[PDB]
Amino acid sequence: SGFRKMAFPSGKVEGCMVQVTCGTTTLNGLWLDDVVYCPRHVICTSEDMLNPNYEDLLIRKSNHNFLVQAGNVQLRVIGHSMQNCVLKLKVDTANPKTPKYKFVRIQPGQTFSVLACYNGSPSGVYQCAMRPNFTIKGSFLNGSCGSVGFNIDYDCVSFCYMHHMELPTGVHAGTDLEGNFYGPFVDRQTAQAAGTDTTITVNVLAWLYAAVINGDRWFLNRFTTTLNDFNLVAMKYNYEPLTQDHVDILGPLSAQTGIAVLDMCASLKELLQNGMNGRTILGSALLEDEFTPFDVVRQCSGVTFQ
Amino acid sequence: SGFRKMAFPSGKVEGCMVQVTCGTTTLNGLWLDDVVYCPRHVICTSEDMLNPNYEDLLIRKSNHNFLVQAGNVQLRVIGHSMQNCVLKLKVDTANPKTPKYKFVRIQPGQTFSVLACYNGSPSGVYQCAMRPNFTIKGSFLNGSCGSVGFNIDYDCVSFCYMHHMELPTGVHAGTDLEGNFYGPFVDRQTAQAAGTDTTITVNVLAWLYAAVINGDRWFLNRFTTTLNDFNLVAMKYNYEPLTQDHVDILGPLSAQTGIAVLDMCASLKELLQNGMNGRTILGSALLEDEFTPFDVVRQCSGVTFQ
Ligand SMILES: *C(=N)[C@H](C[C@@H]1CCCNC1=O)NC(=O)[C@@H]1[C@@H]2[C@H](CN1C(=O)[C@@H](NC(=O)C(F)(F)F)C(C)(C)C)C2(C)C
Ligand SMILES: *C(=N)[C@H](C[C@@H]1CCCNC1=O)NC(=O)[C@@H]1[C@@H]2[C@H](CN1C(=O)[C@@H](NC(=O)C(F)(F)F)C(C)(C)C)C2(C)C
Q1: Coiled-coil annotation: which residues (chains A, B) (predicted)?
Q2: In the CATH hierarchy, which fold is given to the domain comprising B198-301?
Q3: Backbone CA torsion sign across B224, B230, B236, B238
Q4: How far is the CA of A301 from the CAs of B62, B121, B125, in angstroms?
Q5: Strands B100-103 and B156-167
């Protein structure tokens, strides 16, 4: 038993982290086969940050202007190009530690692990959700850009996030590995704010099932609700609409516990309207929305990765 | 900015995980140089669990009775011995991925990362604290025994925990890597309960400093207190005594923020007496005690490991 916010093992990604320096700026890059992927703002000076013309700046760069290091080893850059907000640096050496991998654009509500890195070296690993407003609630300092987020399935690493910037609330924004931002953000030091966020309803339901599986059942009531009536309540409390797709995805947990999804919806309705009265669920005083249904099943069934 | 419960990167430990099977029982082992360390109850049948005589059971085992697998590769066992509640299986192959490592017995209040494993394969990584009552609040299923906990410093992995069992509250107990249990527990299926736990005061103070560093300062008041008077209040709320050693350890964070430790103690006193009135600190509705002062500094300063 027990339920923790658990990250994927990071070893396969650790072997891909490198340092990229251009001029005075150093950040992290991701080395896969003979390409290093990093945020394009590595080619900026501090002054270039209000409104850089990245296409112009890169025109004046040569391969030798990019210093790439894997541990102590220098990797010679033999070509370079820009794809949206990422640079692709071709190097003369293929990474011998390249895992089986894919590039994926994740959907809001989905979770992934972040391997926080500085100077090409890993600092720590933690699990995040793509928020409905296309931010993540991370932990990132100067020099962390190019740190990546990923999921693992069996032996395949699906890279889904590259870190680029921090927004006023202390929340974080970045791109997929093709360099397209999540959300309406741009890689320049101008006034930008996250949109209003919302709570990921299907994930809260998943975590309530995890609670039942671990024996924390005080919040289960005797009622049911319709989907439409539940979503009228969810809306008032800034929760995402629950769709039939979401209900279908919760099927496995509903089957395991014998609690119909709409019965769990009635129990969540009561929590939203009445609060928890100082009680906790799985050790938490707030409702948790950063576990997907798949996260719950994988952790409660012991899925492993090779 | 941001503050997350962050685990160490797990790659160095991933390379050390193996599967150990004896008879019908399979669990995890730790392969370092030419030795595999695992819980001794691998040699038990389900019936042997109420009160096994481990010394007797091991007498009847031969090297070939232990099937050790690293990935798909079998590792031939060429000797075996017991040290307290762990078995040491000498194998014919030294692990080529052995990191620089130490075995350490951690103190209550200290934190470490757990690499949860099944069948020798990693499932996930999360950060835990050794509770004052010598348990941890983990996430562990059948087959997880032999999963380890560790800290990293630079390139050195300090292994501090091996998982053995689950106690009635859904909390977890295990040994150091010399096989000595943390706390008054034994590796047998008999009635055992965790002692009453207490809150790790120095760690709560550390996390309040982390909050200030991230800009969450509403709970700072204008008062100070003496050490003695603070500990009278801490005692009532089941908090550990704060010692001068603890105050000295908080020195770096106190210097960084300019808030004297005893001034922070006065603010914590008020939180304990008055509650949070529905406010959060670093996103939490409860006071957090599983970050050490070193954890806070490392995460807020970006310490990395090579
Ligand atoms: C990558 N190394 C760095 C990560 C930041 C560093 C500050 C603390 N937390 C982080 O995630 N990225 C950047 O510094 C980055 C780059 C330049 C500015 N910027 C920002 O994150 C800025 N934020 C914003 O401009 C905005 F509010 F719009 F989000 C701040 C003000 C430095 C945080 C560009 C966007 C190219
Ligand atoms: C290791 N594979 C396994 C881990 C358990 C499995 C159950 C769910 N969570 C876990 O951490 N360890 C054991 O099964 C183990 C071994 C045998 C029984 N035991 C227990 O953990 C039991 N707990 C207790 O006896 C006690 F309450 F005293 F802590 C339970 C009842 C199976 C949980 C021995 C101690 C040799």
Answers
A1: none
A2: main proteinase (3clpro) structure, domain 3 (1.10.1840)
A3: positive
A4: 33, 14, 15
A5: parallel
Give the amino acid at B151: N
Give the integer Cα–Cα distance in Å for A303 and A293. Answer: 13
Q: At what angle do helices B201-213 and B261-274 cross, to 10 degrees?
A: 100
Q: Can you read off the two tokens belonging to residue B67?
A: 């099937």
Nearest to B122 among A116, A141, A305 (CB): A305
List the Cα angle A210/A216/A218 in 5-degree steps.
Answer: 125
Å resolution of this model?
1.9
Give the residue among B69, B7, B10, B12 at the shortest CA–CA distance from B38.
B69
d(CA A198, CA A129): 12
Helix (H, G, I), strand (E, B) or coil at A3: coil
B15-99 CATH fold: Thrombin, subunit H (2.40.10)
Could you tell me if A1 lies within 8 Å of chain B, comparing CB atoms?
A: yes
Sign of torsion over alpha carbons A250, A252, A254, A260: positive
Task: For domain B1-14+100-197, give the CATH number.
Answer: 2.40.10.10
Nearest to B125 among A125, A143, A171 (CB): A125
